[PDB]
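To the team - OLC complex, inputs and output below.
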Amino acid sequence: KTTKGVQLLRGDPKKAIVRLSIAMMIGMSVQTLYNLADGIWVSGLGPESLAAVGLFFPVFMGIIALAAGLGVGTSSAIARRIGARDKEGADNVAVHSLILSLILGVTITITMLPAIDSLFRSMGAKGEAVELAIEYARVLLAGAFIIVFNNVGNGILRGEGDANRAMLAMVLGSGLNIVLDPIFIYTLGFGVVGAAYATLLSMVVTSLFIAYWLFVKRDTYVDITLRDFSPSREILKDILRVGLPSSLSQLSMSIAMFFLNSVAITAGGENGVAVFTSAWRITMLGIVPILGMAAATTSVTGAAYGERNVEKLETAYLYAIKIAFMIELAVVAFIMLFAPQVAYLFTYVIKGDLISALRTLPVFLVLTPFGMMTSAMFQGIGEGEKSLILTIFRTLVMQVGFAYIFVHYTTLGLRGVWIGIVIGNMVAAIVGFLWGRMRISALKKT
Ligand SMILES: CCCCCCCC/C=C\CCCCCCCC(=O)OC[C@H](O)CO
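Output:
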């Protein structure tokens, strides 16, 4: 009645942080590799194919945000029950989360399918452009349930500390999508819609593995059955108090990027937006280790909170920050030193401005862990609303705010955008860190 994952969660927090975060970073790196490769295949199909992907992209990211939001709500709620040695509670959360995956996933499909035509056209698309985007979108929308299920499955695994399988499920899915991409797009000649089917099939296979582990081998720590299922308002509210604000955090980010783009356009037009796009994509690569660490932090602080061990929660939180800080130091030094080389490789025009960008913009990555791990621990203790507030403050008030100030009130132009983004992120990192310290001392008094 105990797994390696549960032993890990109930063990030394530093050991748990390292194991989980390495596992998440590996899984997320394969997801990143898939994305880069798919970007390349699609690029060679022409403007009409890119524009079709472009039309669906906000919807698709919205679907990811909802799925991953439910996943982290699930992870946190399970980790806390396990820490509290509430086995029946952990079982019931898992069952609840799986029923929610069906409700959410299918709702996404049935709501968007009849909406996408009007949506794409309202975006300014006409005739053939509309038709191609719909062919592409409907394949992916068909798998909305699968996506949510996979994310919930991953959430359950992370919640009970099973770093190994959570990682494996990510590797299998993105790895299979990497294999199927050139075969569906070019070999079978399906073009852009081929990329959608490669993705749909990859997700289906992932779900088959997860369903096998959960329902056939039944070798997770949590027991999952409908025989023992009694609807719980408290469980539903617990999941959504982390899950909904997590999803909304992605929305805040998306809105922020829109404004950031408009500022880049104001400063540099098509040239400026191109430089920003490239510099941001490269800098977001440095974000990957932080995300893996955040996922670890949520599970580990959750378990500690359930155990009512504030010392343990604080240790995991601060150790996560320290490790992410060190990693980011190396990442930033690397990009800063090798900016011309890095630019050369991602461009194949905008070289000089991109090099400047790569030697200013990535600086904020060094302070990101202080805010992001705080957000992850807020989620671990179940207070997702605080994580959302911090996310809004960083992305919309600080990032966009300062970027706007430097461009409208100074003569820095493009460089002012990078500087504003850096300054904004760093202020938010300090505020978030201070809030986390305050929250923790409050815990010690409670
Ligand atoms: C454009 C070029 C793109 C190149 C694309 C390369 C794709 C590499 C994919 C996976 C390897 C990454 C390392 C994966 C390590 C996984 C370790 C693991 O999952 O362990 C399972 C566990 O041991 C169960 O017993």
